[PDB]
């Protein structure tokens, strides 16, 4: 069973020197930003999105459990104010490398269901780089629908 | 410094099984391989490519370190018999996702040439996907120079 | 404008150099250890810091960038795990020489309290020999203030 | 007084990249190379001065240091095989950040008087970027005169 767990001060620092060097490695490999540009642009984007780290308000991180001693991963989710649908956005999801392959994913995307719906979110947002086909893959079985695709082409 | 320490069967086992599943993916990504294909297509070639596993003659996985506790990533090589240019191909290499970002690949592709030298190798091969543009340009920038291109159309309906 | 980004591992081998051989020339600037010592010291006092170079948990090693064609100076903050008042200490902290004297501290300062928040620090902490008198004013400057004072004196 | 050493493999690596680092920003500041470009167009400078680093041949790499203790700068000559007019050209000179003005540098020019006139060298030459108005106060006063200049004029951006 994969509980979700609100993050510690220690996890939660971790996953944003994991999640902010990520990011900025997914966006170089979805061609969006340059090499020597997307660390910096990373720590700031997530700096923005977290000024007061776990203490942003309507922002819940956590740490995906199997159980008290395996953090499987992460789950980070923004609950707009007062959403007109009450959607809450899925900033991010995933597992760590030695938990993949398990299905623990899938378990932990209705985990999020089920905690979300107890909360009052109706509807769930995310996006996912193209170029992460398995995760795409998932998140259409589990029922998610895309709704806008990005695009782009190199020239002559 | 990136130090190589031959594997374990604890660490290929579990190397195995991650390469494996990622191969796959890379295959689908490039087109290569149909998703549902994916993963049957690349165990198969895993285990024909390493019969005895750790034990096939030749070839030669290690653990990259940073120290005795931070293991960066993974680098396996094959020296065929008696090359005639004494070369040896590279079925795999790279950090893991908690290293990656720090500038550690390219001294692991510095660790991989004196590591080579030191064993007679005298020229270094490797197959890197069309869309993997990062490794691309890191292979490029340590000296590595592109010889085969394999491209693919697909027509309309 | 001066912003964070975590420090390669170039970087790094010319940064603890640069200041394992300066926290030797400081630490003989004070007495505190004799001329023919310190370089053997300094190299010992940074490699018990940094047993995993800049993998080592906790510790946060980051660039400090004017633009994306060099990095202007380095910021060394250790974030104690389970800290009662959340405090970090900042133990290395500097611009190089051809990027000193612009005010560009004072704004690596500023991006440092930035990400300490986001990061859920709520106190910082330093060290700083006596005889720099110079970072001594900048830290009082931006907020710092003295708790804990070393002082000697040679008898013979 | 300021004496010179050879230059220790330990002390190259890390005087090599400081100077490889530090050419890429006069350059760059002079306007003379693209920000862009610096870092790697310097590597290939002193790549193809110092192809044998250390043992580069009728290279000099000195350290600068008061007593056997302290290196607190460098020295780097090339005496040329059969000059000619039997001349040593500077490639680089200076002082580590924490050594300077304590007039160091006059006193290790005096000592590359010194070296260069025990070894035949009857003429001293140098490069100074013209920003460099500290050093070039300094060879000024050690009896250097300028010889040529290189000048650059924007029109536009
Ligand atoms: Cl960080």
Do not use: C
């Given at each position: ?22 990011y ?5 490999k979805?061609?969006t930003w340059?090499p020597e ?7 700031q ?11 942003t308000?309507?922002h819940?991180?956590?740490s995906?459990?199997?159980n ?20 809450a ?43 992460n ?5 998932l ?14 082409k190199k020239?002559?």
């Amino acid at each position: 069973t994969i509980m979700l767990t609100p993050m510690q001060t220690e996890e939660f620092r971790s996953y944003l020197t994991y999640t902010t060097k990520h990011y900025a490695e997914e966006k170089v490999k979805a061609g969006t930003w340059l090499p020597e540009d997307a660390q910096l642009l990373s720590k700031q984007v997530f700096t923005d999105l977290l000024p007061r780290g776990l203490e942003t308000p309507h922002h819940h991180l956590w740490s995906l459990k199997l159980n008290e001693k395996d953090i499987v991963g992460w789950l980070w989710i923004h609950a707009e104010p007062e959403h007109p649908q009450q959607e809450a956005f899925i900033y991010d999801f995933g597992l760590y490398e030695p938990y993949r392959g398990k299905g623990y994913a899938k378990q932990a995307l209705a985990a999020l269901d089920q905690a979300a719906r107890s909360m009052g979110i109706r509807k769930l947002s995310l996006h996912v780089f193209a170029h992460n086909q398995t995760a795409r893959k998932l998140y259409e079985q589990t029922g998610f629908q895309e709704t806008d695709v990005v695009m782009s082409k190199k020239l002559l």
